[PDB]
């Protein structure tokens, strides 16, 4: 890894220290270099011992005069890449392109070093280990270094613009994958002008991504809107105002499988949520949500609520029976019993309970039949982490459906203890509604605020809570293990004692005392110590830290919610059928434009 890399780098410095030919090369001691060149016995095929050449050394140390003195005796090393392991295709052309020495590049081309020689080393790779990615071919190096005249010379001497890389990259791709410069826009427009012509923008990568989609997923929004400017068509100005239009053809990609919009909204990079603030896509999603999406979402949530209440009243009238046996025991109250399934299905009231139960199970199965094939399309770990997509809301509903499937199987086997999974699935189905709580404006950002907060610092409170109550509950069980439980209560054994302390930490239950009877001496001190250390001390710190956190994320949560609503929009337009979704756009074939949809827009200038 990195340690291996630095070790072999230091070994490279050892080998460059070793030979006096290479050492005088990197020192540029041209008087002694004339002696070495005068030496016939000085072998000139001697390369760097860890996979480099002498011209590579002179290119590193920029000693171009020594390079000229090298090129007569061995010009063939100018055409040679060497055999280092991270540096396997590397030529001195790449270093000369990097160090911007046009006379050196011109001298290398005077020997005729091939530009089409490509360099794909192990260090020459997109990596977190790699600090800089510059592409493979020397055109990519000329582009990212931004030397105009060098890449002009490369055009003059070859260097095809159609360049195919490992990972299918092209010059456009590595221009996108770049820390942004306005100079990069000029370089882009330059090479676009020097393109002759299908069109070169049409090619995707090896992954199958056009540079339009790459710019969309990476959000270099200056480059994005600048690339949009070529497709921008203005129509007419008058007075203060200007009517223009856009070709929304490539921005929809409705005919494609993977749309632009679902590509942009599904990304691990953050800044892409900014790129939706560009004007034509903003107007598009605004028009598109405002015309259809909000009534469909309202009626869908309404039908879900109507399902849930029928499920609830199904859960009310479970068939039950008197308890048959006798308890023979104080501290034992269990007067109820399950019915048998032959015993249950007996009445008209049971008949309507059964048809309600049928409604519940036929609403249970459609959740699976809806969403299970959607999971295989995307990565499931990618699917669950996206809070914008509501992954954690998908976590609850599948467990809900699984448990409501399981409880009927538990019924049909005459198995006891169905009340516990029923109690689970009931509260899970009721807390399921907060996904559909997204759609209102007033209701929207609040739930993703609390969803951020429950992951935020709740564990920080919880772990400390557990250890401090693990102390005090044991202390209380030791200090009450000697006397009458008929008077003290809550501290008979350790498991009721810890739950007593959990009840009484939160102040829900009042502190225990009997003022008729006597009380032991230590418990006053211990309980007062617990009260000062727990009740007011860090509970208030939770309030303060909570307020500071809400104060900080108060800006960002609305920015999140704006992306969340259009994520919901593109999801529902994916899954609904198309006769409910007519084409949004302006069919120019009506107007003789032909098979394209546009969008007209205007304002006055400021």
């Amino acid at each position: 890894w990195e340690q291996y890399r630095d070790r072999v780098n230091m070994l490279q410095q050892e080998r460059i220290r070793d030979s006096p030919l290479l050492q005088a090369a990197k020192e540029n001691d041209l008087r002694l270099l004339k002696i070495l060149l005068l030496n016939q016995s000085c072998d000139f095929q001697q390369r760097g011992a860890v996979g480099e050449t002498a011209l590579h050394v002179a290119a590193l140390y920029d000693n171009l005069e020594a390079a000229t003195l090298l090129m007569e005796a061995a010009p063939e090393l100018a055409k040679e890449p060497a055999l280092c392991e991270p540096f396997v295709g590397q030529t001195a052309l790449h270093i000369a392109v990097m160090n911007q020495n046009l006379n050196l590049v011109r001298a290398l081309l005077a020997r005729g070093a091939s530009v089409s020689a490509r360099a794909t080393g192990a260090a020459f790779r997109r990596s977190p280990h790699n600090l800089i990615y510059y592409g493979e071919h020397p055109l990519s190096f000329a582009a990212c270094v931004g030397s105009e005249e060098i890449v002009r010379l490369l055009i003059e001497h070859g260097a095809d613009i159609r360049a195919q890389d490992s990972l299918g990259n092209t010059v456009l791709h590595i221009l996108i994958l770049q820390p942004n410069k306005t100079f990069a826009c000029q370089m882009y427009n330059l090479l676009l002008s020097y393109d002759e012509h299908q069109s070169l923008e049409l090619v995707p990568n090896h992954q199958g991504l056009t540079p339009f989609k790459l710019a969309g997923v990476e959000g270099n929004t200056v480059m994005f809107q600048h690339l949009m400017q070529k497709r921008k068509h203005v129509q007419w100005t008058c007075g203060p105002l200007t009517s223009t239009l856009y070709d929304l053809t490539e921005i929809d990609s409705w005919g494609e499988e993977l749309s632009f919009l679902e590509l942009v909204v599904s990304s691990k990079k953050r800044e892409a949520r900014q790129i939706l603030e560009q004007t034509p896509v903003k107007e598009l999603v605004s028009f598109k949500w405002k015309k259809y999406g909000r009534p469909y979402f309202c009626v869908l949530a309404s039908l879900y609520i109507l399902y849930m209440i029928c499920f609830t009243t199904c859960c009310i009238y479970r068939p039950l029976k008197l308890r048959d046996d006798n308890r023979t025991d104080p501290r034992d109250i269990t007067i109820l019993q399950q019915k048998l399934l032959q015993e249950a299905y007996v009445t008209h009231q049971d008949n309507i309970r059964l048809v309600g139960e049928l409604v519940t199970v036929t609403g249970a199965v459609i959740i699976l039949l809806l969403e299970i094939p959607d999971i295989f399309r995307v990565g499931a770990s990618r699917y669950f982490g996206q809070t914008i997509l509501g992954g954690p809301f998908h976590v609850i509903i599948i467990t809900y459906a699984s448990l409501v499937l399981l409880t009927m199987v538990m019924r049909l086997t005459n198995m006891n203890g169905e009340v516990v999974p029923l109690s689970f699935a009931l509260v899970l189905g009721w807390c399921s509604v907060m996904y559909f709580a997204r759609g209102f404006q007033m209701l929207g950002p609040f739930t993703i605020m609390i969803q951020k907060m429950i992951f935020g610092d709740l564990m920080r409170f919880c772990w400390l809570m557990a250890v401090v109550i693990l102390g005090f509950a044991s202390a209380f069980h030791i200090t009450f293990q000697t006397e009458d439980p008929n008077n003290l209560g809550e501290f008979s054994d350790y498991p009721t004692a810890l739950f007593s302390t959990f009840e009484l930490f939160l102040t829900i239950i009042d502190g225990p005392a009997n003022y008729s009877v006597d009380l032991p001496f230590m418990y006053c001190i211990t309980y007062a110590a617990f009260a000062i250390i727990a009740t007011l001390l860090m509970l208030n710190l939770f309030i303060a830290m909570m307020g500071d956190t809400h104060w900080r994320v108060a800006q960002e949560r609305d920015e999140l919610w704006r992306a969340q609503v259009v994520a919901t929009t593109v999801m529902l337009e994916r899954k609904m059928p198309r006769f409910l979704w007519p084409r949004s756009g302006i069919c120019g074939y009506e107007y003789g434009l032909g098979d394209r949809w546009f969008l007209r827009v205007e304002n006055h200038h400021d």
Partner: protein
């Protein structure tokens, strides 16, 4: 003067590539394609308020001649007004003209006047 020579200190370090303490023509030559220190101090000498100098000196905590964001936030918390941390970075984006993440005396005095 001391912040002024602090500007030329890091400047001379930017010219000095090998860090030998000199500026050769080869170090000068690599600059042109991208387009001693007392020798450099003397050479830049011919090329070149009290309260503002007093204001900067209490502001720059380490005395490096360059106020960081954390030094500014520590002053901003010492001011007594609540601000988050993103707009503090915008304050650096408001003042850092050459883009070093820092402010000198000269970026400071153009802001005040």
């Amino acid at each position: 003067t001391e912040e002024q020579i602090a500007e030329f200190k890091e400047a001379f370090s930017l010219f000095d590539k090998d860090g030998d303490g000199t500026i050769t023509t080869k170090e000068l030559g690599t600059v042109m394609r991208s387009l001693d220190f007392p020798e450099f101090l003397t050479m830049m000498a011919r090329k070149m308020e009290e309260e503002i100098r007093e204001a900067f000196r209490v502001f720059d905590k380490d005395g490096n001649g360059y106020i960081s964001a954390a030094e500014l936030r520590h002053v901003m918390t010492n001011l007594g007004e609540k601000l988050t941390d993103e707009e503090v970075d915008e304050m650096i984006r408001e003042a850092d003209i050459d883009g070093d993440g820092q402010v000198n005396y000269e970026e400071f005095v153009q802001m005040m006047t």
